[PDB]
Scaffold this motif. Sequence first.
Motif, PDB file in Angstrom:
ATOM      1  N   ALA H   7       0.794  -1.204   0.103  1.00  0.00           N
ATOM      2  CA  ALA H   7       0.030  -0.199   0.076  1.00  0.00           C
ATOM      3  C   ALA H   7       0.758   1.199   0.051  1.00  0.00           C
ATOM      4  O   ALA H   7       0.513   2.351  -0.735  1.00  0.00           O
ATOM      5  CB  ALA H   7      -0.926   0.197   1.176  1.00  0.00           C
ATOM      6  N   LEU H   8       1.786   1.243   0.737  1.00  0.00           N
ATOM      7  CA  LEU H   8       2.666   2.540   0.905  1.00  0.00           C
ATOM      8  C   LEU H   8       3.428   3.007  -0.281  1.00  0.00           C
ATOM      9  O   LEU H   8       3.890   4.077  -0.623  1.00  0.00           O
ATOM     10  CB  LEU H   8       3.497   2.464   2.159  1.00  0.00           C
ATOM     11  CG  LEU H   8       4.435   3.636   2.663  1.00  0.00           C
ATOM     12  CD1 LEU H   8       3.433   4.749   2.706  1.00  0.00           C
ATOM     13  CD2 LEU H   8       4.965   3.461   4.161  1.00  0.00           C
ATOM     14  N   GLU H   9       3.994   1.661  -1.068  1.00  0.00           N
ATOM     15  CA  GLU H   9       4.661   1.935  -2.334  1.00  0.00           C
ATOM     16  C   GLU H   9       3.927   2.533  -3.407  1.00  0.00           C
ATOM     17  O   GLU H   9       3.969   3.460  -4.187  1.00  0.00           O
ATOM     18  CB  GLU H   9       5.533   0.700  -2.912  1.00  0.00           C
ATOM     19  CG  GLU H   9       4.409  -0.346  -3.154  1.00  0.00           C
ATOM     20  CD  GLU H   9       5.220  -1.541  -3.594  1.00  0.00           C
ATOM     21  OE1 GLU H   9       6.416  -1.303  -3.776  1.00  0.00           O
ATOM     22  OE2 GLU H   9       4.772  -2.439  -4.468  1.00  0.00           O
ATOM     23  N   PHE H  10       2.417   2.289  -3.141  1.00  0.00           N
ATOM     24  CA  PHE H  10       1.298   3.006  -4.135  1.00  0.00           C
ATOM     25  C   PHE H  10       1.358   4.359  -3.590  1.00  0.00           C
ATOM     26  O   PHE H  10       1.145   5.223  -4.734  1.00  0.00           O
ATOM     27  CB  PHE H  10       0.123   2.477  -4.154  1.00  0.00           C
ATOM     28  CG  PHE H  10      -0.945   2.772  -4.883  1.00  0.00           C
ATOM     29  CD1 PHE H  10      -1.221   2.262  -6.020  1.00  0.00           C
ATOM     30  CD2 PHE H  10      -1.847   3.773  -4.596  1.00  0.00           C
ATOM     31  CE1 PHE H  10      -2.084   2.766  -7.085  1.00  0.00           C
ATOM     32  CE2 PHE H  10      -2.639   4.264  -5.315  1.00  0.00           C
ATOM     33  CZ  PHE H  10      -2.965   3.862  -6.653  1.00  0.00           C
ATOM     34  N   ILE H  11       1.262   4.675  -2.515  1.00  0.00           N
ATOM     35  CA  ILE H  11       1.340   6.188  -2.107  1.00  0.00           C
ATOM     36  C   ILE H  11       2.432   6.985  -2.547  1.00  0.00           C
ATOM     37  O   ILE H  11       2.466   8.131  -3.320  1.00  0.00           O
ATOM     38  CB  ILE H  11       1.161   6.386  -0.782  1.00  0.00           C
ATOM     39  CG1 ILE H  11      -0.312   5.908  -0.104  1.00  0.00           C
ATOM     40  CG2 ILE H  11       1.223   7.840  -0.372  1.00  0.00           C
ATOM     41  CD1 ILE H  11      -0.331   5.508   1.233  1.00  0.00           C
ATOM     42  N   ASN H  12       3.640   6.382  -2.308  1.00  0.00           N
ATOM     43  CA  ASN H  12       4.875   7.069  -3.036  1.00  0.00           C
ATOM     44  C   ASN H  12       4.818   7.250  -4.544  1.00  0.00           C
ATOM     45  O   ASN H  12       5.165   7.886  -4.926  1.00  0.00           O
ATOM     46  CB  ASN H  12       6.048   6.162  -2.587  1.00  0.00           C
ATOM     47  CG  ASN H  12       6.346   6.619  -1.135  1.00  0.00           C
ATOM     48  OD1 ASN H  12       5.727   7.221  -0.532  1.00  0.00           O
ATOM     49  ND2 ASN H  12       7.780   6.342  -0.741  1.00  0.00           N
ATOM     50  N   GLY H  13       4.337   6.184  -5.003  1.00  0.00           N
ATOM     51  CA  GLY H  13       4.291   6.216  -6.594  1.00  0.00           C
ATOM     52  C   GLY H  13       3.556   7.316  -7.261  1.00  0.00           C
ATOM     53  O   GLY H  13       3.903   7.951  -8.227  1.00  0.00           O
ATOM     54  N   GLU H  14       2.513   7.728  -6.649  1.00  0.00           N
ATOM     55  CA  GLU H  14       1.513   9.096  -7.053  1.00  0.00           C
ATOM     56  C   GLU H  14       2.416  10.162  -6.950  1.00  0.00           C
ATOM     57  O   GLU H  14       3.204  10.533  -6.090  1.00  0.00           O
ATOM     58  CB  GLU H  14       0.391   9.087  -6.206  1.00  0.00           C
ATOM     59  CG  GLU H  14      -0.310  10.241  -6.484  1.00  0.00           C
ATOM     60  CD  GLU H  14      -0.136  11.570  -5.527  1.00  0.00           C
ATOM     61  OE1 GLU H  14       0.668  11.350  -4.710  1.00  0.00           O
ATOM     62  OE2 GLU H  14      -0.588  12.516  -5.765  1.00  0.00           O
TER      63      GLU H  14
END
Lengths: 102, 121, 56, 422, 50, 388, 188, 49
Positions: H7-14
């Motif tokens: 989940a947290l790498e998805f937030i960083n990806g944005e």
Amino acid sequence: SLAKSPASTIQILGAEKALFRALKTKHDTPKYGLLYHASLVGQATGKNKGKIARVLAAKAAVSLRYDALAEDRDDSGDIGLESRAKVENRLSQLEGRDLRTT
Amino acid sequence: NPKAFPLADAALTQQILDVVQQAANLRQLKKGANEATKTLNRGISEFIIMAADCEPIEILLHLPLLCEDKNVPYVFVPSRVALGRACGVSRPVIAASITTNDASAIKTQIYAVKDKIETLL
Amino acid sequence: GPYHIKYAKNGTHLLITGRKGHVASMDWRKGQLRAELFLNETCHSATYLQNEQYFA
Amino acid sequence: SSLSDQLAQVASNNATVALDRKRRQKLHSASLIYNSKTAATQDYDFIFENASKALEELSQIEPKFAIFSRTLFSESSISLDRNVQTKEEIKDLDNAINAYLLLASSKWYLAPTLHATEWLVRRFQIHVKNTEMLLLSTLNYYQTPVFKRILSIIKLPPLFNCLSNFVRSEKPPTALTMIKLFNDMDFLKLYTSYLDQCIKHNATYTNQLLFTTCCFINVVAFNSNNDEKLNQLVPILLEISAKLLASKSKDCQIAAHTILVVFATALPLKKTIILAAMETILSNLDAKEAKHSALLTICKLFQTLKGQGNVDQLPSKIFKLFDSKFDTVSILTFLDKEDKPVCDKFITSYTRSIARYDRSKLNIILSLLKKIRLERYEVRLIITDLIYLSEILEDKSQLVELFEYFISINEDLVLKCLKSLG
Amino acid sequence: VKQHLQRETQLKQVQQRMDAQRELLKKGSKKKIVDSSGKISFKWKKQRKR
Amino acid sequence: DESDSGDINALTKILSTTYNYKDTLSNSKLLPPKKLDIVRLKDANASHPSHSAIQSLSFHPSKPLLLTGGYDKTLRIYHIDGKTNHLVTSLHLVGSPIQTCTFYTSLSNQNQQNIFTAGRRRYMHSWDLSQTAKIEKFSRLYGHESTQRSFENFKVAHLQNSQTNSVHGIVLLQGNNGWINILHSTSGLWLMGCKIEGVITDFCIDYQPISRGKFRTILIAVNAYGEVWEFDLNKNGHVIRRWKDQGGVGITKIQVGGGTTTTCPALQISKIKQNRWLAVGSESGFVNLYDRNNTSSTPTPVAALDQLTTTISNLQFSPDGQILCMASRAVKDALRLVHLPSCSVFSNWPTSGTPLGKVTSVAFSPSGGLLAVGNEQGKVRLWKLNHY
Amino acid sequence: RIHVLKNIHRESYGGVTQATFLNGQPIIVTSGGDNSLKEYVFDPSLSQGSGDVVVQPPRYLRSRGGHSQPPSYIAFADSQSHFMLSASKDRSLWSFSLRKDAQSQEMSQRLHKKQDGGRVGGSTIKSKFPEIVALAIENARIGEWENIITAHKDEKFARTWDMRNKRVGRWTFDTTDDGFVKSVAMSQ
Amino acid sequence: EDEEDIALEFINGEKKDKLVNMNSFTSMFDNIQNVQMDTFFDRVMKVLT
């Protein structure tokens, strides 16, 4: 000599007779001077003429100083052209406003 | 930025920017090149601070000519954004002036920095 | 109400008189009101005189 | 309701009857070419003769004006009075006038249109009866002196109340007031209907589309903070965009691209609405210029997606629709240009589509990944599907090469995908 | 020439007191501080001009 | 005339079926940019009020406990549930004003829980975690007393001893002239010291994972001028980088977010993460935000927030790094929440009616999206972010 | 779709049980299980042309109603049997008329501006006052100032109402001993 | 590896995008004369980007 003048003086440069009469007799001072005949001031209307004189004089000092004090100035007017765009944008939004309620 | 001279070091800039903040709170500070130009003409300027990162630098280069004419110290600081925040405004400032006042509460600090700027010239 | 109506001889103006005393003279075609009286009284009938200028 | 209020409604109904001389003076004085003092002195024969000449000049520019020489600009129209006409006849007359205003919309810069339209103003009193159609057709000329003359001789309908200040004024209406007029929802329905008629008749032109686009774009901007009001905009402007896209005109399509792109940023939408938008954008994509704008629009719309399924593979129908209108070589060219807009989410969705539906293109995926740098999570999703591909699909040189590409870049992440999957 | 200098200093002092009052008219938050000698001055709060 | 009986009209049909054209934010993991869904809960301090200003707030890393402190010299721990918020325990420390307090849990031994509190005093208190309280006082600096005349500004972090792979806590303190003194959290021994030029104003800590079970701790210290140092505490606190905050003057605070931090501590080694955000406060109210993910001696900031016009006294990110809360104790209601990476200040909240007062403490819960705000009146007010 | 009228009737009581257009009219009569009967009207379009496109959304015209849940407290408002005050578990206080149903009206809960000048403390989302356990009414000073007192469930103060204006009053009475209000009375 | 780490790498990806404000397309009226649609569409992209 012009380059070393502040932008306020350049605004009212040609109207010393009205300026110093007003300053000594505690009355309101002129706001156009010799710049009144510039094209941008002509496009403005009403009180916007006083505002554009303030804006145009300030940018004239910016461009004029670049002309006088630049050692390796190009003969292109690039600083003036970008300065001109800022005043036109200022004129456009200033004129776009309508005082009367719609 | 060769034209910006003398340019203060980091240690001196912090001292200059400290006085500029104190002068601002005491309303002893004039902000802007046009408003700084006037104080030289009226002979009420303790010294002039200028920003070296101003672009084009020439818009503030008339002040050294006026300052050497009137014998007023002047110094450059590297950043105009930092100068604006010290002045206490929301915009960048390319030039500022400390107004003369011999009854000011920060007279000693102004003279201490003024001496350092003289040495720099 | 009720309303008693009289037209002018040339048909250009309408005169209405309400029984409770509302009298109005108007140009019904152009929808323009020439007069409106709220006489707090019992009015029975009204009429135009030689032209729309005067009425009784 | 008071008697005066009722008589007021009677007055509006009989506005143009010309019951007396004074009423004739006001009605006949209204003119688009002449001042009041001269206009009242004129006669219907004099007005018609000039209009007949003007229509011929327009007929030379565009043949379609020649039809009205039989109906609105006939000699027998001089003796035609609307007030004595029946309801059915008046309805036919209004259709003819509305058709004329559509054609003349694009030629108001030309002098002859102003003379030809004078006949309709003086004979058929369109400035009083067909006032909404006249204002809508000339809306994009709001800065022109012609629009100023229209405002002087016209009584504004309720929906055009914003312009009441500029009726008989020195300054023309400002661009900021045009936004306020469009800001109303009732007006947008009115403008949507008019714009629909132009599309049906293929009467749209670039200056109209440009002016319409800005007002629509500004209306979204002015309502950006108000999310509730943005939702009420959705049925209107997106419905307009679908109509514009269906039009064969490329300028209409490019306008729909502009409207969609701004609104998607203004209010992120469900992926179904986004997916439906592509099907419409691609369904009628034939012009090259529209093809360039469509691709940028598609990439932007995926950027707005921020929910699960953000980078999921396109449906089979959408993928098959996309590649036909945009060949793989085309998108590689799109990725080649250094100034490409951010399109990582779309390429990730496209990349996962290729593996699902096209095995021969697996070599293309290797080129695509090199051309564009994808996000950390997007790369993980691609690796995950390719791991599934090896287990199901036969091992290939291109397939292992794709893995080898990931071995070269971020070796550690490939292990995590393998660890979680197998 | 001496009288010209004396007139200049007086005009300088009058203007400075005038400017001091004009600053009080402007917006901001200020506190009056009074010395033992009785001199009155104002200290402005450290709030950036928005 | 009409009967129902890639197609172009696909967009029109989907509009007919869909009545709500907005994607349900429940599924999305990224919060909306400009609209904040925030609901107020019962005040934390309502059960047992405080007799001073709330100088520091801290959420327990795992348990649902909130800790308060202030010049009333009392440490009050409340069980935050949102509806009752009763007081678990209190501890009065005679003659020990509390300027900062914080929970600490050993990264290896999860059972070890401790509370460190400090004030304008030459000692520090540690409370191991009910007949009595186990309190230890740290007061010895091992020859470095001159550099440290108060423990009032301190922070606790995790240090991995790479030559043995063991992990232990460290207490970082602020010195006289640029000095940062690093102490062992348990034994209290002086481990290393870090020095910068000028007056040290604030410092923060960032973790950079190396491999499986390995991470390094970096001490980020900033000057009032705006020059930023970075020390590697795994290599005797030797400088590894120097840079300057663009347009920085009179800096007041510096903070990192998006990874492990004091506000979002980790529970195990693998949970250690690196922070992708950095914010630098200032007296003028400006806050320069930097994207740590993307090195140069002079880096350009992503944004320069200026909504607040007074000195920035709090800088704190949400545990996921999607919100930055910047507050000022100079004036009332001076709290703003900033959405990342948009860097846009939320408009709907706080409002003119939101009670915040002189904000002096701010805390984010490690999970659950609770926001606690203390003020000079001694009232800790609690909000819930519905997105989390 | 012309428009959608959201939550005209409560879902918990069956939503819109009946909605009928009046024959040949722009008026639609709606009903539901919440003991309410409403009417909505379609105004004429604001466009002089294309009226079918520019459709005014339906406007509330008139309605009749009562409590949605059984009343908890009742009282006689006056010496005559004209009016009664009733309070229900649906958090609403109603004034019901025995003489004619049309005179029945719901007492308003809009609050008066505080006399001190400070901001009143409450949630921005408006909610009805809790259920009324007790009520007390007098008519010696009707029209002069507040003449009703009510006690609420699990609430530490009593609210006042005004029968003449049919609105909540500007005073709130607190127990001052950290206890809930159990009894309310008024002097004659 | 855990689901939260996913989940947290998805937030960083944005990544950051430029939001649309009221004063973002007002200048478009100024330069809307004698201009092709495609160039107009590009300017909408430039301000949006």
